[PDB]
Amino acid sequence: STIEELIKAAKELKSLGIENIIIEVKSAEDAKKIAAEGFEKILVSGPKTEEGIAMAAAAKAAGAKNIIVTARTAEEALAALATPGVTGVLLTTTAEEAPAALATLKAAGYTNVIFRGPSIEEVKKMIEYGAEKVLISSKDDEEAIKAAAELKAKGVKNIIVATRDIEAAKKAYEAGASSILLVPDGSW
Ligand SMILES: [Cl-]
Ligand SMILES: [Cl-]
């Protein structure tokens, strides 16, 4: 789907009262556009954290509020978190490495790190190790929405659910997701 389609869907969600949304972007031009539109939480996602950092600069210059950068190591997370205007990181890691990553980020004074993993099982391991914010995603979204609701009922807070169309976004909201991530490769 195109960026205009994603903007329309995000505005529709907001008009329904669904305000706890995060917009994912994959280029600096899109980051500027989403920020200029006034969306309050933007995920900048590039293959390399350096590309995300350049997108964060474009979003900040266009007025962004909260900017989350993707990373796959603790070192990359620290580089992003130290960048002006960046307010959080989405760290793709494994349960094996999460203890060390958590300790490293904490010692540096950073807490706003969202963990994601390759399987819902590994994400549950990350929560056990002390991950306080997680992102759940699945091929069909329905699996992710169900897992988030189960964890929420087990007392887990700050679950972000990735969604690929507006029906899934609404279901994730209704199930109590802390935030809903709108992924651009979806059907909007
Ligand atoms: Cl605009
Ligand atoms: Cl918003």
Numbering used by the authors: 1 to 188
Please quote the paper that reports this structure.
Here we use a robust deep learning pipeline to design complex folds and soluble analogues of integral membrane proteins. Unique membrane topologies, such as those from G-protein-coupled receptors, are not found in the soluble proteome, and we demonstrate that their structural features can be recapitulated in solution. Biophysical analyses demonstrate the high thermal stability of the designs, and experimental structures show remarkable design accuracy. The soluble analogues were functionalized with native structural motifs, as a proof of concept for bringing membrane protein functions to the soluble proteome, potentially enabling new approaches in drug discovery.
